[PDB]
Amino acid sequence: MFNNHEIDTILSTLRMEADPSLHPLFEQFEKFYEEKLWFQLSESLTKFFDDAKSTPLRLRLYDNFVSKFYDKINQLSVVKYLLASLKDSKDFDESLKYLDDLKAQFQELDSKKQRNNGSKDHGDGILLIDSEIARTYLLKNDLVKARDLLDDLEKTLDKKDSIPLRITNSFYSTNSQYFKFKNDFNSFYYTSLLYLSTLEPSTSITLAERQQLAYDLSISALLGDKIYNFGELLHHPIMETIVNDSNYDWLFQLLNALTVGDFDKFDSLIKVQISKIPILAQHESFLRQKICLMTLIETVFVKNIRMLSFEDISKATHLPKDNVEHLVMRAISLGLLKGSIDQVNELVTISWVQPRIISGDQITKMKDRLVEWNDQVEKLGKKMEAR
Template sequence: MDIDPKPIPEFLAQQRDEHTPAELQPLMLDFEDFWERKLWHQLTTALDEFFRHPESGPQRLGLFKNFVMTFADKINQLKLVELGLWASQECKDYQEALVFLETITKKVNNVDSQDAYVYAIVEVARIKLCLEDLKGARIALDEAEKILDKFDSVESIVHASFYRVSSDYYSTKREFSAYYRNALLYLACVQSTELPQAKQCELAYNLSIAALLSEKIYNFGELLLHPILDSLVDTEHAWIRELLFAFNTGDLGKYNGLLGHLDKQPLFEGKQQFLRQKLCLSALTEAVFQRPPHDRALTFESIMKETGVSADEVEYLLMKALSEGLIRGSIDQVAGVARIAWVQPKVLDKGQIENMRQRLMEWDGSVSRLNKYMEEKLSESVTA
């Protein structure tokens, strides 16, 4: 780092007189006062307020290098990294930012500040992603993950940073399942409503894409229940939210009505057959779910009707559902019947909840009738 040789009071006075906007000058006066009195906590708080102000941009890098680094060991190391991240935004390019952040990473690499070290190394990984150094980013993230695994609790800001950069890495690699998992973990560490609206929409859209294109994700429940999905309402991407709900219920008609949107998305090119199979699997599980537990023997003909598959696709669809753990049961090829003992739970919409309510009422009625029948038989045996 380039260091200005001026004494601290002279450096701060020059910064205040020549570069600091009027509204920030009181903070500059506080810097010198707190520094002289060695009030490190108060100084850190004042610096944090200064660095967060949009007008402080041109001064952040110089202040960090020539002022903050002179007492870096005396302040909270996590806050030191955070101030460094604000300052790194003023670097002229990603390469300069990488060198700057690597210097901070070395500074906080000690046993007493592992959270700060992870925070710094994850941000190094982020810059390496920007420089298209995927191998370097992976190495940094793996190192961070090893340390995070030893933490006794979740450090919101550190874990959020790790999951955010990890999801960016998997997005670049187009590994949809891993992206989906890490992006949801990131949202578990932050308040999604506090994110900028554009960021909410971007996350919701990317999560929806990942859920649909992943070869391992067949249950979108966690995403469907997350409020971030509502950020797509009344936007140009509202259709993909509708598509997710169509997949959740296996709604073939709604899916066909949204095909026009899919054709315009490059990521879905050549994926129509895969998406159709995924939808048919959802339609199959929905058909099983709609039936009471004692009536889950589905004929191949009924499966064809419910899922829209042809006769020669029924057995493959059932085998796929069994192998993915969506259902449990057996297939009688001779009789042309699938006997389902269990179906994977899924998120219910209002229509499905009403359907379940009706089934519970029917079950309650049958139990009441059985109870009445038993009472009548008991009464007859007593009088006899």
């Protein structure tokens, strides 16, 4: 369209006093090909609105044209394009040449201080290119060369940082696909959780990237035995950002399946295209053991008695007594519980560890507890003044 010769012309006339980079012949090739609204390459404010939706693939020649930007502005958004924008095109072959041309603090560092790499929009590539080289070898070569470049990124982020979150976006982006191929789903959920915190403010806030990110949380939160099971899903608005159809339905039905505890629901909820992984085969029985164990704690609790028994645990989880002293013992060793189980006298003494976040029922109950404590101290305090 004419937005190249209209928006960019007004901003180059009233604002820009001189136009070294504005030429009619250079911008003529832009309108000659794509006549629609979305363009390929641009400058001034127009280039920020453009995205990869049209897949221009012209940014290789756009980087060579940055030499003309030096007479206009410094180097800011040059890092946002090229190596940072090639992730949508998914080309690991020709992208290797631009990795060795820039590197860190060679062509990007002359008169300008550190903008903190390629985090968002403006910046000069320092730690971003080194992070993408590890990502380049992540989807092509093994993970040995990828982790070697991530060691200097973790030490630098913890050393030099700022109040907001910028570098963490590019830092957790490589770790998002790094732990996906691994067998650890507990650290994979913690990585995608902090990466989602930076997705809402900026960096492709459209629902296209939100539905793709939810596929990582749905697998990690289900297999993750660390923090509850579904507890973290109801707090943060995760499921609220996606739809209920196109294989997203099994995430919403997981709430009622874990709450009720019916074993027959898990068979029809997870088909053979998912449960075929050996990870879930071991975690198939780990979902109902943790929820029913924490449920019996609040049920038997009256005042000082948290004590349980074997019949309460065996009838709840439908498990034999041989697994009562085993599966529950594994959760105790992970820091979920303190007290142990007595096999001789048939008594189960469990202490209190889990803070039980998001309750709301005990708030009205603990209100009278503070009044009872305040009355006993005040009653004994008045006797201290008399005698």
